[PDB]
Amino acid sequence: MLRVAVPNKGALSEPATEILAEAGYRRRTDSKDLTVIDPVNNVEFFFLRPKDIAIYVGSGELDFGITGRDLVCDSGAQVRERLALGFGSSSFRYAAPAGRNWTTADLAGMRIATAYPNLVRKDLATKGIEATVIRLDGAVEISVQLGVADAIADVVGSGRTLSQHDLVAFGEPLCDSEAVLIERAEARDQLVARVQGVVFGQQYLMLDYDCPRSALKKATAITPGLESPTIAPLADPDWVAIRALVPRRDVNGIMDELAAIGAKAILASDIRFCRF
Amino acid sequence: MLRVAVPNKGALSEPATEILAEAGYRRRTDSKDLTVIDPVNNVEFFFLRPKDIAIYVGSGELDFGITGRDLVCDSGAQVRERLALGFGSSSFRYAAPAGRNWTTADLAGMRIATAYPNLVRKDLATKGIEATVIRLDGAVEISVQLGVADAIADVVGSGRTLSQHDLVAFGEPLCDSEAVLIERAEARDQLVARVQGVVFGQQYLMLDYDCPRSALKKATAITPGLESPTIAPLADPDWVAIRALVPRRDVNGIMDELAAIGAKAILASDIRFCRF
Numbered sequence: 001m002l003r004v005a006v007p008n009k010g011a012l013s014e015p016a017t018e019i020l021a022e023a024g025y026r027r028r029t030d031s032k033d034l035t036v037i038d039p040v041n042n043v044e045f046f047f048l049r050p051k052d053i054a055i056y057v058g059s060g061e062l063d064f065g066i067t068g069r070d071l072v073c074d075s076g077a078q079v080r081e082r083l084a085l086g087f088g089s090s091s092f093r094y095a096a097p098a099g100r101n102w103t104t105a106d107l108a109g110m111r112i113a114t115a116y117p118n119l120v121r122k123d124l125a126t127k128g129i130e131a132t133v134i135r136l137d138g139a140v141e142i143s144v145q146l147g148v149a150d151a152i153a154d155v156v157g158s159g160r161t162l163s164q165h166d167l168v169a170f171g172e173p174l175c176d177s178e179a180v181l182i183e184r185a186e187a188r189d190q191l192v193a194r195v196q197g198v199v200f201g202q203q204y205l206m207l208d209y210d211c212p213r214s215a216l217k218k219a220t221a222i223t224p225g226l227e228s229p230t231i232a233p234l235a236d237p238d239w240v241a242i243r244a245l246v247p248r249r250d251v252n253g254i255m256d257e258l259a260a261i262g263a264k265a266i267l268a269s270d271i272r273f274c275r276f
Numbered sequence: 277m278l279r280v281a282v283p284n285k286g287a288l289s290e291p292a293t294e295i296l297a298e299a300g301y302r303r304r305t306d307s308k309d310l311t312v313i314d315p316v317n318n319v320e321f322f323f324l325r326p327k328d329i330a331i332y333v334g335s336g337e338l339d340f341g342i343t344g345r346d347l348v349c350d351s352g353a354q355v356r357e358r359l360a361l362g363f364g365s366s367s368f369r370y371a372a373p374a375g376r377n378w379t380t381a382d383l384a385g386m387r388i389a390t391a392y393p394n395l396v397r398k399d400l401a402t403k404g405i406e407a408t409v410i411r412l413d414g415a416v417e418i419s420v421q422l423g424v425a426d427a428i429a430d431v432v433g434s435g436r437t438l439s440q441h442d443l444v445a446f447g448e449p450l451c452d453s454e455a456v457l458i459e460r461a462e463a464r465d466q467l468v469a470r471v472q473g474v475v476f477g478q479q480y481l482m483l484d485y486d487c488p489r490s491a492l493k494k495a496t497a498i499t500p501g502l503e504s505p506t507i508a509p510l511a512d513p514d515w516v517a518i519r520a521l522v523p524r525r526d527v528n529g530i531m532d533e534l535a536a537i538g539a540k541a542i543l544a545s546d547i548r549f550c551r552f
């Protein structure tokens with residue numbers, strides 16, 4: 001029996017639910033229900049406050065959780081980070097009023113507002129800088145305008161929020177975060193393998209294309225696949241169909257290369273999961 | 277120019293907006309806008325995270341805030357509590373698995389989950405009890421079931437949430453909370469007076485009733501009003517109309533008493549605000 005924590009709301013919740021569904025686990029279909037019992041897989045899913053997931057895994061009975069690396073860092077929980085899941089990427093930055101040459105040294109003795117004060121205190125300590133870290137619940141940007149803080153430390157996605165409050169990021173990031181599968185410090189191995197199959201498989205597309213036999217050597221070099229491309233005859237003896245897994249991020253350039261050597265009906269399909 | 281913080285969401289937000297509107301301040305009509313400029317009254321309203329209001333008032337440029345007494349306590353902010361506003365009442369309690377004789381002494385060495393850890397640590401210190409306080413973002417009840425904590429400390433309204441998670445409250449309350457108007461440690465006096473007028477006035481109804489002249493002494497004793505009841509003749513010389521402010525909570529018993537001495541057309545009306 002495994003117990004897995006999943007963010008109940010926020011930007012990580014849907015993608016986390018999707019990755020688990022993709023791995024074959026039962027979905028939360030009625031969204032107002034905080035628990036999902038998966039008899040088939042013998043897993044119980046608990047839909048918890050995003051901020052709290054790491055504590056539940058590190059100090060509770062939960063075997064795994066999906067949450068953000070920054071939140072794990074801020075929680076102080078001792079958990080194993082097993083996989084980065086391919087969503088929820090962001091960078092955590094210090095920021096202060098725009099138009100000034102803020103650098104890390106300026107942080108000394110500042111009041112720094114943040115919703116991740118442990119993460120911020122640890123970063124300052126590493127830098128050898130003393131400052132006054134002020135915990136806020138969120139929406140931290142407005143704290144500078146309203147006189148609570150001199151600077152902030154917060155998640156930076158597009159950077160839109162900072163610009164909207166006339167703030168500019170400075171310094172190296174405090175954390176480069178991504179959603180992660182964390183495990184409490186055979187059943188467990190199965191779940192990690194299944195989630196890994198989705199993480200890995202979502203990076204590829206399956207490419208199928210018709211190729212003239214005269215172009216087969218060239219095509220084989222363009223799409224080597226994970227082991228070696230699959231080659232099957234067409235009814236027309238002068239042609240074959242080739243199948244190869246290709247990185248999702250290179251598929252267009254690959255299609256262009258194949259078209260240039262005479263490939264036809266070049267198509268891509270999604271895969272659910274893949275074990276190398 | 278005054279700056280006032282108002283909860284942007286949660287159970288205190290609507291009543292806080294209403295009390296300010298009742299006091300004559302400009303309403304937030306477009307709810308998605310975090311600021312409201314009130315040129316007429318020279319007040320700017322900032323709609324902030326409920327948890328953060330006390331820090332903004334205590335350490336920021338905000339002159340006042342409406343928030344909960346428990347949140348002020350947990351914030352550690354040094355602010356003046358000027359008025360209790362008549363809404364948001366609750367009690368903060370320790371709770372643990374139902375069916376057992378939990379008492380305060382049992383808390384020693386326990387892991388106690390709560391979203392108000394400062395409030396809880398101060399209460400434990402007063403009691404001379406050491407324990408491990410675990411900060412959670414909210415939805416703390418499930419923490420006992422999931423093995424993160426032995427007990428919780430949380431707001432108790434109806435008590436429904438505790439019962440739903442098989443928990444029972446024990447011990448004296450850690451705080452008896454209510455929504456409050458807090459001020460940073462002539463313009464300010466005006467705002468307090470105006471909010472006070474609403475707080476005070478909302479406790480009364482204005483009662484008007486027709487009364488036979490033969491019953492006037494008895495009626496006067498039943499409704500003495502705040503100074504003395506207003507008495508005005510009706511067109512019918514054998515009658516008068518009496519007006520008196522009466523506590524909202526006693527109005528029905530008062531109406532019964534008046535009806536028993538022959539009063540007719542006994543009615544109550546709301547008032548907006550009242551200065552004693």
Ligand SMILES: Nc1ncnc2c1ncn2[C@@H]1O[C@H](COP(=O)(O)O)[C@@H](O)[C@H]1O
Nearest residue numbers: 011068088090155156157158159160161
């Ligand atoms: N704590 C967070 N965890 C994951 N993504 C976030 C977080 N905070 C902000 N983002 C994302 O960052 C994107 C834009 O970044 P920004 O304009 O800097 O706020 C938004 O679409 C958010 O979904």
Ligand SMILES: Nc1ncnc2c1ncn2[C@@H]1O[C@H](COP(=O)(O)O)[C@@H](O)[C@H]1O
Nearest residue numbers: 287344364366431432433434435436437
């Ligand atoms: N932090 C809070 N501040 C003000 N009211 C609250 C708070 N938490 C819960 N309540 C109220 O308490 C009521 C019911 O209490 P309970 O079943 O004990 O959760 C709910 O209708 C809530 O609006």
